[PDB]
């Protein structure tokens with residue numbers, strides 16, 4: 618690692634870990650296309666098992682980037698269109714409020730106020746239908762962006778229906794394996810249990826629990842090395858040999874809606890580079906990130922702009938993650954931690970590091 622990398626990383630992350638009391642953390646910085654790795658702390662406190670290159674973390678909502686890209690792949694395959702009504706793939710959703718709600722809306726949180734979370738009481742596919750059939754929008758389709766598991770989650774589950782494959786098998790066969798993410802799982806197999814960090818919420822060790830649309834919204838676990846490879850793949854989709862995966866990646870970074878200075882892709886979110894740091898830092902605070910905001914349609918969507926800051930936050934009960942990258946400058950960062958700590962702290966650190974290297 619060039620000194621400047623070490624310099625910044627240690628200066629920025631160390632106090633961050635101490636400030637946020639983070640038990641374990643892994644950081645990857647992609648600099649002129651190459652990854653550089655840093656780990657701190659314990660994956661398992663009680664076991665005193667260190668974080669390593671092989672430790673799996675719960676990505677939480679960073680999983681949405683996989684879901685957007687898989688969806689992008691399905692479009693490229695000619696299997697769905699984002700202009701398809703949701704009812705085309707779920708005909709049992711017959712209540713009148715669904716008419717005019719398209720896959721684009723679900724994927725980009727503009728269906729009209731689908732809720733932030735699918736309620737814990739929703740378990741069976743029966744509950745799931747009832748939940749969406751009873752939901753009442755707060756706004757008309759395509760007018761407001763309200764960040765929501767239940768929106769992008771539904772998108773993921775429906776996007777895979779023409780393939781006939783489950784969501785997990787589609788993700789594994791169409792995205793993980795081709796990008797050679799061999800330590801990335803929706804369901805961590807036994808041979809990896811020893812590498813799967815615990816999360817910590819107020820001192821208690823926790824792992825995410827089964828939830829409806831969990832795999833689609835928040836259920837990916839991956840290592841720092843596989844997450845660097847995800848970033849490289851999204852920095853440079855042209856190096857990618859699978860035609861439809863290449864195209865799916867590019868579509869996930871198309872700009873479909875603008876709210877303030879951000880643009881909504883499929884999973885990914887984007888801003889023009891150069892970016893005002895206050896804007897992404899402050900925008901990451903849940904009082905803005907979770908608020909409803911008006912959207913302007915970009916008709917037709919703007920193709921992936923290389924001069925972009927492209928990013929996504931995610932968290933579970935016990936974990937906190939952030940990924941950001943700038944395709945023009947071949948620069949990116951991954952931050953995985955096994956405590957959920959405030960979004961703006963992550964984004965601030967990330968900006969300090971990548972600003973210092975740009």
Ligand SMILES: *C(=O)[C@@H](NC(=O)/C(=N\OC)c1csc(N)n1)[C@@H]1N=C(C(=O)O)C(=C)CS1
Nearest residue numbers: 677678679733766825835930931932933934
């Ligand atoms: C994505 O990260 C997603 N987060 C979650 O669904 C969960 N927690 O967030 C704190 C979650 C899933 S299972 C479990 N026990 N907890 C969305 N992001 C946020 C966020 O913090 O950025 C949310 C507030 C909930 S929805």
